[PDB]
Amino acid sequence: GHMDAPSNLRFLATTPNSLLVSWQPPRARITGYIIKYEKPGSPPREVVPRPRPGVTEATITGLEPGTEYTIYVIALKNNQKSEPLIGRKKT
Numbered sequence: 001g002h003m004d005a006p007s008n009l010r011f012l013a014t015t016p017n018s019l020l021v022s023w024q025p026p027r028a029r030i031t032g033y034i035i036k037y038e039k040p041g042s043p044p045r046e047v048v049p050r051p052r053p054g055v056t057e058a059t060i061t062g063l064e065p066g067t068e069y070t071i072y073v074i075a076l077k078n079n080q081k082s083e084p085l086i087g088r089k090k091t
Helices: none
Strands: 007-010 019-024 032-039 042-046 057-060 068-076 085-090
Touching: 019 068, 019 085, 032 057, 057 068
Parallel strands: 007 085
Antiparallel strands: 007 019, 019 057, 032 042, 032 068, 068 085
16 A cells, blocks of 8 residues: 555547536656546545556546546556545636
8 A cells, every 4th residue: 555646637629518628647656537427515425437557548437517626546556546636627
């Protein structure tokens, strides 16, 4: 455990209820990632299945319009995880 966390949570393309995001992988070897998303009033969820290693972008579906969701993206190492890297935006 104890691994750095991704950075610069960016957004690729954005759909009326889906949202693509792009980050800068942490500074340590990893074999997976976690990505949650939040909204005012409802608790976070996780992008499933967990992203693959080597990818610096993920899409998030199942959102709501006119709503800026807050994403928490983490680095994994065999279910093990690092600190989060968050960023929010609207669909």
